């Protein structure tokens, strides 16, 4: 649900991004110096914690901390609110990073369309 | 036998038959536990048309929704170690093609 | 349109007979002549038998018969988190690195 | 489950319904009154009376039998015999 | 020993106990419904205990107590998979069945065969427990067909009602089409994986194909 | 295939439910619609939410069937909402139990059914799913509310319609 | 307790069932209000949804069209 | 035991939607003779019934008071 | 059920059955009592409007059109009483109905458990056996030479007789046997 | 006016909508009288046998005996090889056999071709 579906289907699919092919531009295209994402939890730590493969994303350390907090205070199942909020906030930040990637792809596509239209106009004239 | 009268004092109430009357050749399939031919509030042709139309329309719309899916304005999810190369059963000896995710 | 006199008479006679039959169907004060041959206590007897005996038998069967052949009872290995104390060897699994904490 | 019916109870309830009928004068209504010979109703009125009794006692009277119930005593006897009432 | 396996198997066994007592004077008396309800309550609490054990440390187990038969390279054994799904669904089902049994004590008081009704309810519960805790496809199929036939027997409770008989047979027909799908999936899994248990099926089927998954979908 | 089958099942069963007059039939169609919702949950790759909804549905649907059975038994084996009525004050406890069960079924913001159905709907909307399946799921939720209102309205509100 | 049947009249009720029904309805409403007071984020959301139109091309790494 | 039927004269269609039906039928030129037999349903304890919104809010008044008291007690405990 | 059927339904019987069926389906449509009373009064008004009609051909055509209107406008799921043939509680107790011939195959110990019931049962059996010849004689005296033209049976014309063919009607199982 | 109801073989025409129900000839009434007379004669015979106190056993039903006999033992003596019967028998008894033969032979030929070419996933197929 959203306006992006309307723009892509009842509009210019060339200008709108394709979720199954994104990204289609190099990561450094437009970023002079871009920093690689940092992973806090190690493979051994995640493997020992037995996180499900879907849960082994870049927010895994907060999930591990939440699990450890829940296990220790077992009878009191309401004593992990801070850890839960930390994990949720990290997931929120990851989601907004994904949204930024989608928006960057979209405006790069429309900039490419403008550039190619300008080149075609110049070649014609 | 479903079409037969339920208020009559049949000799066999469950089968709705009388003793001595001729038995239909297909009584074994026209019993009340089996094929029913009693009249319906709507015509058979109308019922068939409506049912077929509903199922065909639903199949067509499922295909249309498949070719025009619904999603959110987000990019692909990112996983740390070469999209979890080893965790998904990859070969430790062979070196995977690196996958790098950058901040934004 | 209505009952003919014969139908009325037959129905009256049949209903009288039916009522007499039902009155006969009634039983007697001595009729079911049988041949010669605290709440906590009931719950206590129920609990020891129905719960204690099966758990005894099943624990005996599992501890000494089922858990005597390899791989019959397989427990999923316990989850190990950073900053933990493995009890088998007195091992200390170290804490994670410093988080880039926000707010 | 439910309390058993009795002949007096059936008679009381049928007379109660018939007295709540407007086309019937309550004073001259007795258990032997004929719906058409001495009450002045017609076929549709008898049909409505039978339907009211069906609603009252919660069971259906077949049309083959309901056409002949021309008296409150006949209705009482029919309902009692169908419900297996003997007292 | 860890109480987990003992307590789970004990709940299952004490569910099966009142069926054994169905050839006794207690079954001939009128105390059988209350007896069965009390048994279900005790089983419910005894199953609540391993749920507490799981929610603390996330304990899961499989118990291959009895070995049935070895078809050359395939071993079939009576195995129960006591995991999150089983230890979370058993107490809920027992709670619901306890409430339903008390309601049926009130509701079926006039039925001449209330004792048989309670025996049948307990048999359905036993088959459902077998289905839920089954670790291999054959035991899962046992529970599958058991709940199917118990549904057939309980739908047609009033044998004199032709509508009840038609409903029972119709339920059987649809569940048998589902069983067609189930047998397709079982045959494919055994043929292409030499296993009827979830552990080896998951190990060997890194990319499970359309034929077994569609068989399972049709059964479901 | 699982997602599409679940979507059409929940929609069709709710649509049939909103216009039935037998209370047991209404509850049976509600059960079928909830199963279709569970199948939708599986098809969007959320198996654990399906299990959670299984538990919650067990609770409140069993209670709803018990309440309808109490109504039927109190009215001499009558199973028609056309002949029920006035039971809001005639039967207090079964009335409050059925109202609570209907609120749980439709996802009252903090009852038993809220912790599963709300998450299921959120996951369906936020996933890469079939557009028609999403639309059918939403319509089925609306029709769920509709038939719960139908049960309450024709069974408890109004004037009696049962034999005197 | 034995409840006698009524004919064309409202059935006889009991103080016990009245108070029990009232107590359980009040319990449901108290629970709903109490949970909404404490954790209202489960209904109204917890984190704001960003507006993509407000993200600058500089921070999205988009070069000017001429460049 | 031996339940007694209430007197039949008490059932009337006055102050009942049945009298509105009777007025409509009188305007049409007709009458319905079964008014009172149905009029038992509209009187007595059956006369007043809550609405759909009123039915849902069966225990809101006591529940809200308990919620206010509990919130006040929690606030006092947190402060002290 | 208790009345022998006739060869055909007269016009009055047809119209009365249509009237009852229409009233029942209208009650199914109009759930509430006041609305049902209003529309039932209107329906009876239509029947009374066509009540006086000397032309039987026109009356039959009116009946035919009314039947077509009913079939078009019938309720798809009309209300059926629980014990009625379409009802949900129909034939529920047929599995509990056991006959008295099945009763007489009891073991002597079982029979001894109910000493008083079986004395009256023996009395009933003697009464049945002492009357069969009179019943068959009465039946064969009153039948026409061609045979029975209808399914109705005669009453007992004599002081000491019972109506012919009475045993199973009198001793039929109760509607709630167990 | 109102839409008409079209009867089918599985949804027959109701009696109230049958045109012959409202066109009664005097011969129709005598036909109905004869049918009722036949039914009443049969009913009387069955009832006399049923209420006979000295009867122990089963009232044999000649109609049921005729039905069971005509369903099984009377079919072959009354069968003649006709074009219709020959075509229907050949179809229903030969066509399915060769259809299934073609299906299975084609499937097994493809499987054997894959096996010979050595590009069929036969790993873990220990049981056969
Ligand atoms: C193990 C599991 C189960 C396995 C399966 C078991 C069951 C299935 C297998 C058995 C199937 C049946 C047995 C084979 C057929 C036997 C027929 C037989 O004996 O008939 C005697 C029976 C008695 O003879 P009759 O008393 O002289 O004739 C009485 C007829 O009623 C009066 O006859 P008519 O004058 O009306 O005939 C008109 C017409 C009737 O025929 C048809 O209508 C059939 C139309 C298609 C015929 C073939 C078309 C192609 C012909 C040219 C091919 C050229 C190839 C180069 O005739 C023709 O078409 C001419 C003859 C056609 C060829 C017949 C060959 C024999 O005659 C017939 O039934 C007449 C028709 C015979 C042929 C019918 C079609 C047979 C198809 C066989 C397919 C294989
Ligand atoms: C795998 C091969 C099978 C594929 C499907 C073939 C269907 C074959 C049908 C069975 C033949 C019938 C023989 C006798 C059956 C039992 C006797 C009988 O007919 O009783 C009818 C009985 C009673 O009727 P009521 O509606 O209850 O009315 C009651 C009125 N008092 O009703 C029935 O049971 C009919 C059931 C027949 C089902 C036919 C359609 C089945 C649907 C199959 C297609 C659906 C595929 C599903 C796709 C799933 C996607 C993963
Ligand atoms: C009863 C109460 C008895 C009171 C004393 C308790 C006795 C405790 C001691 C236990 C007895 C010793 C014992 O169990 O020995 C093991 C002995 C056999 O040894 P195996 O290792 O299995 O040899 C291979 C056989 N093919 O096992 C047994 O006999 C116990 C069986 C109990 C298991 C449950 C019974 C099975 C019922 C299911 C029927 C078959 C279902 C098919 C299952 C399909 C699975 C794919
Ligand atoms: C509302 C009514 C909608 C009616 C839509 C009818 C079908 C539209 C269509 O054909 O779109 C073209 C193409 C999909 O067409 P295709 O699946 O190849 O089948 C063509 C054979 N008739 O679709 C496209 O080219 C668009 C593909 C969009 C893909 C989105 C991401 C997956
Ligand atoms: C007449 C043609 C069909 C013949 C078979 C069905 C006849 C009708 C009666 C069915 C009776 C029950 C048996 C159902 C068997 C279903 C088998 C199946 O779904 O196979 C999947 C098939 C092969 O998949 P696979 O080879 O494993 O994976 C590689 C990708 N092709 O994958 C495919 O074929 C791709 C398409 C997947 C969807 C197929 C849906 C089939 C549904 C069948 C049951 C319907 C009820
Ligand atoms: P009593 O013995 O006085 O009965 C009088 C009768 C009716 C027998 C007359 O003596 C009589 O035969 N009169 C002449 C024939 C006649 O009146 N025919 C009328 C029958 S049809 C008619 O005209 C009225 C039918 C209109 C209503 C049709 C119903 C259609 C709607 C049904 C909808 C169902 C759900 C709403």
Q: Is A42 left (phi over 0), alpha (psi -120 to 50) or beta?
A: beta
CA nearest neighbour of D55 among F82, I155, B52: F82
| 8 A C-beta contact, residue E74 and residue E196 | yes
Backbone angles phi, psi at J98, to 5 degrees: -75, -30
> What distance in Å separates the CA atoms of residue E203 and residue J65, rounded to the nearest whole number?
63
How many helices (DSSP H) and strands (DSSP E) are in chain I?
8, 0
Preceding amide of E98 cis, omega within 30? no
How is residue E83 annotated by DSSP? S
Count CB neighbours of I94 within 10 A: 16
| 8 A C-beta contact, residue J114 and residue J120 | yes
- Could you give the C-alpha distances from D27 to B13, F137, H34, in angstroms and in order? 44, 64, 18
I166 chain-C contacts, CB cut-off 8 A: 13-14, 17
CA nearest neighbour of G8 among F71, H46, D79: H46
Q: How far is G63 from chain F (nearest CA, A)?
A: 31
E strand intervals along chain G: none
CA nearest neighbour of F71 among F26, F24, F103, F32: F24
Rg (CA), chain F: 16
Q: Is A27 left (phi over 0), alpha (psi -120 to 50) or beta?
A: alpha
| 8 A C-beta contact, residue B12 and residue J64 | no
β-sheet bridge partners, residue E76? E69
Nearest by CB to residue D68, choosing from I3, I83, I176, is I3
| 8 A C-beta contact, residue B62 and residue F130 | yes
| 8 A C-beta contact, residue B40 and residue B34 | no
* Residue G42 token pair: 């489960």
Four-point Cα dihedral J61, J65, J66, J68, nearest 10? 140
Nearest by CB to residue I67, choosing from J17, J36, J54, is J17
Catalytic: D42? Answer: yes
- Could you give the C-alpha distances from F10 to A119, F31, F54, in angstroms and in order? 53, 9, 15
Rg (CA), chain A: 21
Query: Residue B4 in 3-state DSSP?
Result: coil
| 8 A C-beta contact, residue E87 and residue E8 | yes
| 8 A C-beta contact, residue F101 and residue F60 | yes
| 8 A C-beta contact, residue H33 and residue F73 | no
CA angle at residue C85 from C83 to C89, to 5 degrees? 140
Helix axes F47-74, E84-107, angle to 10 degrees: 0
| 8 A C-beta contact, residue J6 and residue B39 | no
> What distance in Å separates the CA atoms of residue H67 and residue D57, rounded to the nearest whole number?
48
CB pairs under 8 A between A and G: 34
| 8 A C-beta contact, residue E206 and residue B89 | yes
| 8 A C-beta contact, residue H58 and residue F99 | yes
Pocket of ligand 6 (CB under 6 A): D 42-44; I 11-12, 15, 22, 25-26, 29, 46-47, 50-51, 53, 59, 62-63, 66, 69-70, 73-74
Preceding amide of A23 cis, omega within 30? yes
> What distance in Å separates the CA atoms of residue B29 and residue B23, rounded to the nearest whole number?
12
Please choose from J76, J79, J82, J83 the residue to mutate so as to test ligand 1's pocket, defined by most ligand atoms within 8 A of CB. J83
CA nearest neighbour of E108 among E163, E169, E34, E26: E34
E strand intervals along I6-151: none
Q: What are the DSSP calls for A7-63, one per residue?
A: HHHSS-TTTS--TTT---S-TTSS-SS-PBPP--S-HHHHHHHT--TTT-STTHHHH
By the CB < 8 Å criterion, does F76 face chain D? yes
CA nearest neighbour of E175 among E211, E131, E206: E131
| 8 A C-beta contact, residue E82 and residue C95 | no
Cβ-defined contact of B41 to I74 (cutoff 8 Å):
yes
> What distance in Å separates the CA atoms of residue H58 and residue F89, rounded to the nearest whole number?
11
Helix axes I56-73, I11-29, angle to 10 degrees: 30
> Token pair 């979209």 is at which residue?
A106
Helix (H) or strand (E) segment spanning residue J85: helix J83-117
I136 chain-J contacts, CB cut-off 8 A: 48
Resolution as reported, in Å: 3.0
Q: Three-state SS string across B23-76, please?
A: CCCCHHHHCCCCCCCCCCCCCHHHHHHHHHHHHHHHHHHHHHHHHCCECCCCCC
- Could you give the C-alpha distances from E31 to E24, E43, J50, in angstroms and in order? 12, 18, 43
Helix axes I33-49, H17-28, angle to 10 degrees: 20
CA nearest neighbour of D63 among I70, B37, I31, I24: I24
> What distance in Å separates the CA atoms of residue E83 and residue A9, rounded to the nearest whole number?
45
| 8 A C-beta contact, residue D68 and residue D62 | no
> What distance in Å separates the CA atoms of residue D34 and residue F120, rounded to the nearest whole number?
68
Please choose from E162, E163, E166, E184 the residue to mutate so as to test ligand 2's pocket, defined by most ligand atoms within 8 A of CB. E166
> What distance in Å separates the CA atoms of residue G36 and residue I137, rounded to the nearest whole number?
87
Give residues with Cβ within 8 angstroms of A120, minimum separation 6. Answer: none
* Residue A20 token pair: 């199954």
Q: Which residue of E has its CA nearest to A74?
A: E56
Is the CB of residue J90 below 6 angstroms from any atom belonging to ligand 1?
yes
Q: Which chains touch F (3 or more CB pairs under 8 A)?
A: A, B, D, E, G, H, I
* Residue B57 token pair: 């329309």
CA nearest neighbour of E116 among E214, E28, E220: E28
Give residues with Cβ within 8 angstroms of G20, minimum separation 6. Answer: F92, F93
Give residues with Cβ within 8 angstroms of I89, minimum separation 6. Answer: F77, I82, I83
CA nearest neighbour of E66 among C56, C73, C77: C73
- Residue whose CA lies nearest to ligand 2 atom number 11: E173
């Amino acid at each position: 649900m959203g306006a992006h579906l309307a723009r892509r289907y009842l509009g210019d699919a060339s200008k709108e991004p394709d979720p199954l092919r994104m990204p289609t531009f190099p990561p450094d295209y437009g970023f002079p110096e871009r920093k690689e994402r940092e992973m806090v939890a190690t493979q051994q730590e995640m493997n020992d914690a037995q996180l499900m493969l879907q849960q082994r994303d870049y927010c895994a350390h907060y999930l591990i901390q939440l699990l450890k907090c829940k296990r220790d205070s077992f009878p009191n199942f309401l004593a992990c609110k801070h850890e839960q909020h930390d994990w949720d906030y990290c997931e929120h930040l990851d989601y907004v990073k994904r949204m930024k990637e989608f928006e960057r792809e979209r405006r790069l596509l429309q900039r490419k369309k403008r550039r190619e239209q300008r080149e075609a106009e110049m070649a014609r004239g | 036998q479903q079409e037969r009268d339920p208020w009559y004092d049949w000799d066999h109430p469950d089968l709705r038959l009388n003793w001595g009357e001729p038995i239909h050749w297909d009584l074994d399939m026209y019993i009340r536990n089996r094929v029913d031919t009693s009249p319906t509030p709507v015509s058979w042709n109308t019922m068939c048309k409506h049912l077929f139309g509903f199922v065909a329309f639903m199949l067509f719309m499922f295909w249309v929704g498949e070719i025009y899916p619904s999603y959110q304005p987000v990019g692909p999810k990112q996983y740390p170690y070469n999209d979890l190369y080893l965790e998904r059963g990859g070969d430790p000896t062979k070196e995977p093609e690196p996958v790098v995710h950058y901040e934004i | 349109s209505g009952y003919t006199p014969d139908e009325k008479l037959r129905l009256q006679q049949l209903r009288e007979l039916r009522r007499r039959w039902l009155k006969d169907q009634e039983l007697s004060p001595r009729e079911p002549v049988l041949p010669p041959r605290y709440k906590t206590y009931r719950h206590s007897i129920f609990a020891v038998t129905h719960v204690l005996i099966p758990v005894w038998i099943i624990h005996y069967y599992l501890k000494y018969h089922v858990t005597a052949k390899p791989y019959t009872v397989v427990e999923r290995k316990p989850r190990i988190f950073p900053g933990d104390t493995i009890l088998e060897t007195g091992e200390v699994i170290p804490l994670m690195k410093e988080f880039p904490d926000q707010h | 489950d439910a309390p058993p019916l009795t002949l007096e109870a059936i008679k009381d309830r049928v007379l109660y319904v018939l007295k709540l009928y407007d086309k019937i004068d309550p004073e001259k209504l007795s258990v032997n009154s004929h719906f058409m010979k001495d009450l002045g109703l017609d076929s549709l009125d008898q049909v409505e009376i039978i339907m009211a009794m069906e609603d009252e006692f919660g069971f259906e009277i077949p049309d083959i039998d309901a056409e002949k119930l021309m008296c409150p005593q006949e209705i009482v006897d029919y309902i009692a015999d169908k419900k297996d009432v003997y007292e | 020993m860890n109480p987990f396996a003992s307590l789970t198997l004990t709940t299952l066994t004490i569910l099966t106990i009142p069926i054994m007592m169905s050839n006794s004077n207690i079954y001939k008396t009128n105390l059988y419904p209350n007896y069965v309800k009390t048994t279900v309550s005790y089983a419910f609490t005894l199953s609540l205990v391993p749920l507490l054990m799981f929610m603390h440390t996330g304990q899961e187990m499989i118990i291959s107590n009895w070995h049935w038969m070895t078809l050359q390279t395939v071993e079939l054994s009576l195995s129960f998979k006591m995991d999150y799904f089983s230890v979370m669904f058993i107490p809920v089902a027992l709670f619901v069945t306890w409430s339903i049994m008390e309601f049926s004590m009130w509701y079926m008081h006039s039925d001449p065969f209330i004792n048989r009704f309670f025996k049948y309810l307990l048999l359905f519960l036993i088959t459902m427990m077998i289905l839920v805790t089954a670790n291999n496809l054959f035991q899962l199929f046992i529970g599958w067909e058991g709940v199917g036939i118990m549904s057939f027997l309980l739908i047609g409770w009033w044998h004199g009602r032709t509508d009840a008989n038609t409903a029972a047979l119709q339920a059987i027909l649809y569940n048998r089409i589902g069983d067609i799908g189930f047998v397709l999936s079982m045959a494919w899994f055994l043929t292409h994986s030499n296993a009827w248990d979830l552990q080896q099926i998951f190990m060997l089927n890194n990319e499970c194909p359309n034929m077994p998954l569609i068989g399972l979908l049709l059964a479901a | 295939m699982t997602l599409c089958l679940g979507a059409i099942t929940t929609l069709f069963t709710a649509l049939c439910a909103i216009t039935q007059n037998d209370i047991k039939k209404i509850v049976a169609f509600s059960t079928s619609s909830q199963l279709g919702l569970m199948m939708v949950t599986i098809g969007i790759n959320q198996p654990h939410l399906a299990f959670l909804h299984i538990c919650m549905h067990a609770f409140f649907k069993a209670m709803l069937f018990m309440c309808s059975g109490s109504i039927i038994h109190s009215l001499n084996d009558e199973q028609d909402i056309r002949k029920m009525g006035g039971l809001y004050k005639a039967m207090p406890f079964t009335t409050t139990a059925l109202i609570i069960g209907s609120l749980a079924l439709t996802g009252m913001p903090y009852l038993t059914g809220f912790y599963s159905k709300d998450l299921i709907i959120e996951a369906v909307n936020m996933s890469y799913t079939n557009a028609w399946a999403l639309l059918m799921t939403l319509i089925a939720t609306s029709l769920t509310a509709a038939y719960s209102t139908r049960i309450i309205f024709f069974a408890f509100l109004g004037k009696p319609r049962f034999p005197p | 307790v034995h409840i006698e049947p009524r004919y064309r009249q409202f059935p006889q009720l009991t103080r016990s069932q009245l108070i029990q029904a009232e107590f359980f309805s009040a319990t449901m409403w108290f629970w709903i209000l109490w949970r909404f007071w404490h954790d209202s984020d489960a209904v109204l959301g917890h984190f704001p949804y960003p507006d993509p139109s407000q993200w600058t091309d500089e921070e999205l790494g988009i070069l000017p069209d001429d460049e | 035991s031996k339940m007694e039927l209430p007197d039949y004269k008490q059932w009337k269609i006055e102050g009942t939607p049945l009298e509105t039906v009777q007025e409509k039928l009188a305007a049409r030129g007709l009458r319905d003779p079964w008014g009172r037999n149905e009029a038992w349903r509209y009187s007595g304890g059956f006369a007043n019934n809550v609405s759909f919104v009123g039915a849902l809010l069966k225990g809101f008044k006591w529940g809200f008071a308990a919620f206010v008291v509990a919130v006040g007690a929690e606030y006092y405990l947190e402060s002290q | 059920a208790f009345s022998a059927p006739a060869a055909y339904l007269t016009h009055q019987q047809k119209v009365l059955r249509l009237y009852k069926r229409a009233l029942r389906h209208l009650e199914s449509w109009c759930v509430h009592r006041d609305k049902y009373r209003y529309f039932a009064c209107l329906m009876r008004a239509r029947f009374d409007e066509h009540k006086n009609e000397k032309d039987m051909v026109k009356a039959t055509q009116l009946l035919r059109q009314a039947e077509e209107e009913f079939w078009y406008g019938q309720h798809p799921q009309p209300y059926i009483f629980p014990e009625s043939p379409g009802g949900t509680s129909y034939e529920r107790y047929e599995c509990y109905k056991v006959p008295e011939w099945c009763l007489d195959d009891w073991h002597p110990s079982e029979k001894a458990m109910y000493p008083d019931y079986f004395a009256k049962r023996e009395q009933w059996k003697r009464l049945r056996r002492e009357s069969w010849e009179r019943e068959v004689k009465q039946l064969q005296e009153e039948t026409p030479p061609g045979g029975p033209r209808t399914e109705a049976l005669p009453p007992a014309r004599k002081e000491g007789d019972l109506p012919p063919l009475w045993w199973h009607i009198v001793t039929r199982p109760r509607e709630r046997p167990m | 006016s109102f839409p008409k109801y079209k009867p089918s073989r599985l949804a027959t025409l109701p009696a109230t909508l049958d045109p012959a129900e409202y066109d009664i000839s005097p011969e129709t009434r005598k036909a109905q009288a004869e049918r009722l007379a036949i039914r009443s004669r049969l009913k009387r015979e069955y009832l006399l046998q049923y209420n006979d106190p000295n009867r122990l056993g089963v009232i044999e039903d000649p109609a049921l005996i005729r039905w069971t006999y005509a369903r099984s033992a009377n079919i072959y003596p009354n069968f003649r090889p006709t074009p219709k019967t020959s075509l229907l028998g050949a179809l229903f008894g030969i066509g399915p056999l060769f259809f299934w033969y073609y299906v299975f032979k084609t499937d097994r030929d493809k499987k054997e071709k894959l096996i010979q070419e050595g590009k069929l996933d036969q790993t873990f197929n220990i049981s056969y």
